[PDB]
Design a protein around this motif. Sequence first.
Motif, PDB file in Angstrom:
ATOM      1  N   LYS A   1      10.984   6.069  15.533  1.00 27.54           N
ATOM      2  CA  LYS A   1       9.610   6.689  15.691  1.00 27.54           C
ATOM      3  C   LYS A   1       9.029   6.295  17.018  1.00 27.54           C
ATOM      4  O   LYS A   1       9.209   5.498  17.390  1.00 27.54           O
ATOM      5  N   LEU A   2       8.113   7.410  17.502  1.00 30.16           N
ATOM      6  CA  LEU A   2       7.702   7.298  18.759  1.00 30.16           C
ATOM      7  C   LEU A   2       6.120   7.655  18.495  1.00 30.16           C
ATOM      8  O   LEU A   2       5.930   8.273  17.547  1.00 30.16           O
ATOM      9  N   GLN A   3       5.339   6.895  19.176  1.00 33.72           N
ATOM     10  CA  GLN A   3       3.831   7.148  19.027  1.00 33.72           C
ATOM     11  C   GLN A   3       3.082   7.629  20.126  1.00 33.72           C
ATOM     12  O   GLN A   3       3.259   6.823  21.305  1.00 33.72           O
ATOM     13  N   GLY A   4       2.150   8.686  20.398  1.00 36.20           N
ATOM     14  CA  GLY A   4       1.454   8.778  21.515  1.00 36.20           C
ATOM     15  C   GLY A   4       0.623   9.894  21.560  1.00 36.20           C
ATOM     16  O   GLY A   4       0.143  10.281  20.304  1.00 36.20           O
ATOM     17  N   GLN A   5       0.610  10.705  22.548  1.00 34.10           N
ATOM     18  CA  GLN A   5      -0.430  11.851  22.980  1.00 34.10           C
ATOM     19  C   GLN A   5       0.351  12.600  23.656  1.00 34.10           C
ATOM     20  O   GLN A   5       1.133  12.493  24.608  1.00 34.10           O
ATOM     21  N   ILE A   6       0.314  14.029  23.550  1.00 31.55           N
ATOM     22  CA  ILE A   6       1.247  14.899  23.880  1.00 31.55           C
ATOM     23  C   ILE A   6       0.515  15.720  25.430  1.00 31.55           C
ATOM     24  O   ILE A   6      -0.544  16.177  25.094  1.00 31.55           O
ATOM     25  N   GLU A   7       1.084  14.922  26.438  1.00 29.44           N
ATOM     26  CA  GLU A   7       0.515  15.438  27.822  1.00 29.44           C
ATOM     27  C   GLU A   7       0.877  16.815  28.236  1.00 29.44           C
ATOM     28  O   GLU A   7      -0.040  17.400  28.977  1.00 29.44           O
ATOM     29  N   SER A   8       1.923  17.135  27.917  1.00 31.77           N
ATOM     30  CA  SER A   8       2.318  18.686  28.187  1.00 31.77           C
ATOM     31  C   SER A   8       3.595  18.784  27.443  1.00 31.77           C
ATOM     32  O   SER A   8       4.164  18.058  26.792  1.00 31.77           O
ATOM     33  N   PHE A   9       4.330  20.187  27.555  1.00 35.06           N
ATOM     34  CA  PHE A   9       5.429  20.323  27.181  1.00 35.06           C
ATOM     35  C   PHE A   9       6.036  21.774  27.881  1.00 35.06           C
ATOM     36  O   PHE A   9       5.267  22.404  28.432  1.00 35.06           O
ATOM     37  N   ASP A  10       7.229  22.026  27.533  1.00 31.94           N
ATOM     38  CA  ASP A  10       7.916  23.239  27.750  1.00 31.94           C
ATOM     39  C   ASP A  10       8.777  23.739  26.773  1.00 31.94           C
ATOM     40  O   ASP A  10       8.886  23.054  25.603  1.00 31.94           O
ATOM     41  N   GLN A  11       9.393  24.589  26.960  1.00 32.98           N
ATOM     42  CA  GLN A  11      10.610  25.279  25.906  1.00 32.98           C
ATOM     43  C   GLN A  11      11.343  23.983  25.414  1.00 32.98           C
ATOM     44  O   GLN A  11      11.967  23.970  24.330  1.00 32.98           O
ATOM     45  N   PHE A  12      11.587  23.030  26.452  1.00 32.94           N
ATOM     46  CA  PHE A  12      12.748  22.018  26.133  1.00 32.94           C
ATOM     47  C   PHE A  12      12.375  20.485  25.709  1.00 32.94           C
ATOM     48  O   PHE A  12      12.970  19.770  25.086  1.00 32.94           O
ATOM     49  N   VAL A  13      11.475  20.331  26.509  1.00 34.41           N
ATOM     50  CA  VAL A  13      10.999  18.965  26.233  1.00 34.41           C
ATOM     51  C   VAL A  13       9.412  18.692  25.950  1.00 34.41           C
ATOM     52  O   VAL A  13       8.516  19.593  25.930  1.00 34.41           O
ATOM     53  N   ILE A  14       9.185  17.529  25.849  1.00 33.44           N
ATOM     54  CA  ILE A  14       7.627  17.022  25.359  1.00 33.44           C
ATOM     55  C   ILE A  14       7.331  15.651  26.228  1.00 33.44           C
ATOM     56  O   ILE A  14       8.210  14.866  26.208  1.00 33.44           O
TER      57      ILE A  14
ATOM     58  N   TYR B   1       0.632  25.114  18.108  1.00 34.78           N
ATOM     59  CA  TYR B   1       0.540  23.637  17.413  1.00 34.78           C
ATOM     60  C   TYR B   1       0.627  22.559  18.239  1.00 34.78           C
ATOM     61  O   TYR B   1      -0.363  21.777  18.256  1.00 34.78           O
ATOM     62  N   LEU B   2       1.614  22.335  19.056  1.00 32.51           N
ATOM     63  CA  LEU B   2       1.775  21.497  20.281  1.00 32.51           C
ATOM     64  C   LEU B   2       0.490  21.663  21.371  1.00 32.51           C
ATOM     65  O   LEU B   2      -0.185  20.569  21.813  1.00 32.51           O
ATOM     66  N   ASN B   3       0.112  23.115  21.764  1.00 30.95           N
ATOM     67  CA  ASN B   3      -0.835  23.104  22.560  1.00 30.95           C
ATOM     68  C   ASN B   3      -2.188  22.674  22.004  1.00 30.95           C
ATOM     69  O   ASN B   3      -3.124  22.257  22.834  1.00 30.95           O
ATOM     70  N   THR B   4      -2.472  22.660  20.760  1.00 32.45           N
ATOM     71  CA  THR B   4      -3.627  22.245  20.281  1.00 32.45           C
ATOM     72  C   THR B   4      -3.642  20.767  20.426  1.00 32.45           C
ATOM     73  O   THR B   4      -4.674  19.879  20.541  1.00 32.45           O
ATOM     74  N   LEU B   5      -2.329  20.067  19.845  1.00 31.70           N
ATOM     75  CA  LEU B   5      -2.445  18.883  19.813  1.00 31.70           C
ATOM     76  C   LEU B   5      -2.586  18.330  21.194  1.00 31.70           C
ATOM     77  O   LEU B   5      -2.905  17.065  21.565  1.00 31.70           O
ATOM     78  N   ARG B   6      -2.021  19.069  22.300  1.00 30.37           N
ATOM     79  CA  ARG B   6      -2.220  18.656  23.532  1.00 30.37           C
ATOM     80  C   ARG B   6      -3.755  18.722  24.099  1.00 30.37           C
ATOM     81  O   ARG B   6      -4.260  17.794  24.434  1.00 30.37           O
ATOM     82  N   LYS B   7      -4.424  19.943  24.106  1.00 34.85           N
ATOM     83  CA  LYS B   7      -5.603  20.156  24.422  1.00 34.85           C
ATOM     84  C   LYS B   7      -6.486  19.138  23.648  1.00 34.85           C
ATOM     85  O   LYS B   7      -7.616  18.969  23.905  1.00 34.85           O
ATOM     86  N   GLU B   8      -6.157  18.811  22.714  1.00 36.53           N
ATOM     87  CA  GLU B   8      -7.219  17.968  21.778  1.00 36.53           C
ATOM     88  C   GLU B   8      -6.979  16.316  21.861  1.00 36.53           C
ATOM     89  O   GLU B   8      -7.665  15.562  21.234  1.00 36.53           O
ATOM     90  N   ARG B   9      -5.940  15.951  22.510  1.00 36.93           N
ATOM     91  CA  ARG B   9      -5.572  14.647  22.717  1.00 36.93           C
ATOM     92  C   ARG B   9      -5.464  14.002  21.585  1.00 36.93           C
ATOM     93  O   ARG B   9      -5.773  12.608  21.361  1.00 36.93           O
ATOM     94  N   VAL B  10      -4.768  14.482  20.365  1.00 37.45           N
ATOM     95  CA  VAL B  10      -4.587  13.953  19.136  1.00 37.45           C
ATOM     96  C   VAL B  10      -3.580  12.833  19.026  1.00 37.45           C
ATOM     97  O   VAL B  10      -2.386  13.235  19.629  1.00 37.45           O
ATOM     98  N   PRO B  11      -3.943  11.696  18.577  1.00 39.61           N
ATOM     99  CA  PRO B  11      -2.730  10.641  18.794  1.00 39.61           C
ATOM    100  C   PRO B  11      -1.601  11.503  17.585  1.00 39.61           C
ATOM    101  O   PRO B  11      -1.888  11.860  16.733  1.00 39.61           O
ATOM    102  N   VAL B  12      -0.258  11.225  18.013  1.00 36.92           N
ATOM    103  CA  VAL B  12       0.695  11.861  17.245  1.00 36.92           C
ATOM    104  C   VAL B  12       1.792  10.706  16.746  1.00 36.92           C
ATOM    105  O   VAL B  12       1.706   9.910  17.758  1.00 36.92           O
ATOM    106  N   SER B  13       2.438  10.833  15.784  1.00 39.86           N
ATOM    107  CA  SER B  13       3.761  10.288  15.440  1.00 39.86           C
ATOM    108  C   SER B  13       4.856  11.071  15.777  1.00 39.86           C
ATOM    109  O   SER B  13       4.939  12.230  14.880  1.00 39.86           O
ATOM    110  N   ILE B  14       5.635  11.031  16.807  1.00 38.10           N
ATOM    111  CA  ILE B  14       6.937  11.709  16.842  1.00 38.10           C
ATOM    112  C   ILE B  14       8.213  11.112  16.168  1.00 38.10           C
ATOM    113  O   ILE B  14       8.501  10.148  16.524  1.00 38.10           O
ATOM    114  N   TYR B  15       8.951  11.607  15.219  1.00 37.48           N
ATOM    115  CA  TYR B  15       9.884  11.115  14.649  1.00 37.48           C
ATOM    116  C   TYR B  15      11.267  11.762  15.088  1.00 37.48           C
ATOM    117  O   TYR B  15      11.267  13.086  15.279  1.00 37.48           O
TER     118      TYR B  15
END
Lengths: 69, 69, 69, 68, 69, 68
Positions: free
Chosen positions: C30-43, C10-24
């Motif tokens: 509310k935070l808004q952006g695009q997921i640049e990368s992640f790991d087990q612990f952060v985004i 789910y996250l890797n798709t959101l990353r690879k596709e540059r999809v604007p997201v809303s993180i709550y």
Amino acid sequence: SKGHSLADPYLNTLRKERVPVSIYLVNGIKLQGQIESFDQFVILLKNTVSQMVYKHAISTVVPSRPVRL
Amino acid sequence: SKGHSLADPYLNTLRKERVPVSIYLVNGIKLQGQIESFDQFVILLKNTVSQMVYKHAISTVVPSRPVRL
Amino acid sequence: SKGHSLADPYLNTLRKERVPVSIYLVNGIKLQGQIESFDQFVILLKNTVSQMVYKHAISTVVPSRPVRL
Amino acid sequence: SKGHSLADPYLNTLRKERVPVSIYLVNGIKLQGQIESFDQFVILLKNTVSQMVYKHAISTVVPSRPVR
Amino acid sequence: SKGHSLADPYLNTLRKERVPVSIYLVNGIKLQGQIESFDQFVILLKNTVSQMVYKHAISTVVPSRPVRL
Amino acid sequence: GHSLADPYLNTLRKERVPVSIYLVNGIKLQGQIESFDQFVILLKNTVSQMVYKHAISTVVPSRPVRLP
Ligand SMILES: [K+]
Ligand SMILES: [K+]
Ligand SMILES: [K+]
Ligand SMILES: [K+]
Ligand SMILES: [K+]
Ligand SMILES: [K+]
Ligand SMILES: [Zn+2]
Ligand SMILES: [Zn+2]
Ligand SMILES: [Zn+2]
Ligand SMILES: [Zn+2]
Ligand SMILES: [Zn+2]
Ligand SMILES: [Zn+2]
Ligand SMILES: [Zn+2]
Ligand SMILES: [Zn+2]
Ligand SMILES: [Zn+2]
Ligand SMILES: [Zn+2]
Ligand SMILES: [Zn+2]
Ligand SMILES: [Zn+2]
């Protein structure tokens, strides 16, 4: 960087030298006293009356005076 | 995405680069300073007065200037 | 299912596709952006200013448009 | 009494029946829709727009009609 | 004690004797009903409508009448 | 290591010390520890309640306690 290689020497240093600390909890509440002991899950804060303090409820630990290792 | 493979180089850059960071806590308290060290559980935030912050209490870390991964 | 076998795709798709997201976050921010990368612990969420977001402080990640997983 | 031995079947059943569910967050907010999928950490909750809900953020899952 | 050697027997017995308990969540909400089942992570609370309750968001479980083990 | 947490909790339970128990959400509980495990503490009073440790902020005993 991994494990407790900082958290642990920091807390024993603050134990060994009887440094006054502020302990802020996630609920906002501030505790003060001296760190008697601690294990992986809890801290014993010594003051007037004393308190065992679950680390999961800890936001920050602020020593009263600058410290090092 | 495996392990602390972002959290560790990210934060290590910040410590090594000594960038000003604002640390936002889950309770809506704001911390500011520079990252002297870190391990699996905590982050030493450095400032005029210096604090130790348990990661679990942190919601977001927000540098002052752009950082390159 | 099994483990984090849904989270990363789910996250890797959101990353690879540059999809604007809303993180709550669990505090109701509310935070808004695009997921640049992640790991087990952060985004790593980029936009105006970039920032590292602890997962334990997130409650929902809501895309700006639907996705296939 | 161990593992996710009640969670797994409760969630996996709810998906398979596509019952509308209401998810209440620890912070008191209510999310809603169908469990499309889930793993150890999150639940994909589809709806008008779909979302990923971290399990740790949830307080209660409350189905509309009884499951079995 | 060690492990789950009080929790599991306690909730099991509450399950078996079908005690109507009152479950207070950290967020302050009281959910009153009876325990159908539980596993390591959730309690199922039978009532007019039944509902799955994540244990990590639980503060206390109070029985309607005192119990033994 | 819980080489402090467990004995300390044993000692309040063995000598039957009145304790206050503050919840992370800011409620105070109060009574005596009948028993505990890795996850719960059973706090005794006119109302007997089970308490999950993740919910606890500070355990404050009424009088001084030493741990041999
Ligand atoms: K040590
Ligand atoms: K020193
Ligand atoms: K750099
Ligand atoms: K897509
Ligand atoms: K069914
Ligand atoms: K004693
Ligand atoms: Zn340690
Ligand atoms: Zn804990
Ligand atoms: Zn790390
Ligand atoms: Zn922690
Ligand atoms: Zn993962
Ligand atoms: Zn975390
Ligand atoms: Zn599961
Ligand atoms: Zn989680
Ligand atoms: Zn158990
Ligand atoms: Zn959980
Ligand atoms: Zn223990
Ligand atoms: Zn727990």
